[PDB]
Design a protein around this ligand. Sequence first.
Ligand SMILES: CC(C)C(=O)/N=c1/[nH]nc([C@@H]2CCCO2)s1
Length: 149
Amino acid sequence: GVPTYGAIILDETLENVLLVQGYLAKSGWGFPKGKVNKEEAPHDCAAREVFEETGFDIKDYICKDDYIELRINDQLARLYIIPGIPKDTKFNPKTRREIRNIEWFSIEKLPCHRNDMTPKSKLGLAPNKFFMAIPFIRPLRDWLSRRFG
Ligand SMILES: CC(C)C(=O)/N=c1/[nH]nc([C@@H]2CCCO2)s1
């Protein structure tokens, strides 16, 4: 699978994260990210995708060693951690044919797993609008505990 790159943007209090909502198969909330172009460096891909999806330029704030990376279904997604961005920043996608909405979310209120259906004696997981973000939540909380406190 082609690698994807993006960002986890936090505010100045470290208790809110910026998520974006797409359409159709990307109809829920997730971190801004996308697929790398041929010959494009990881940091340049992350900045390009975040600016296309949010209108905010991270290039002068990326730190090379500060990211969370996951391999899901043999595809690799790497999100650079960007703290300290003011909550009154004006965010605007480049293409609203791809992005429905942009919002801050409390990290402590976000889910870190989906719920089962054991009350119905049925296998699988119940739907949740944060499905694309959920895999990053626990590793982000653990990263923030080790780096800050
Ligand atoms: C109404 C809208 C915000 C919403 O929830 N969209 C979803 N689309 N995909 C979902 C399911 C559950 C997780 C796996 O796929 S949830």
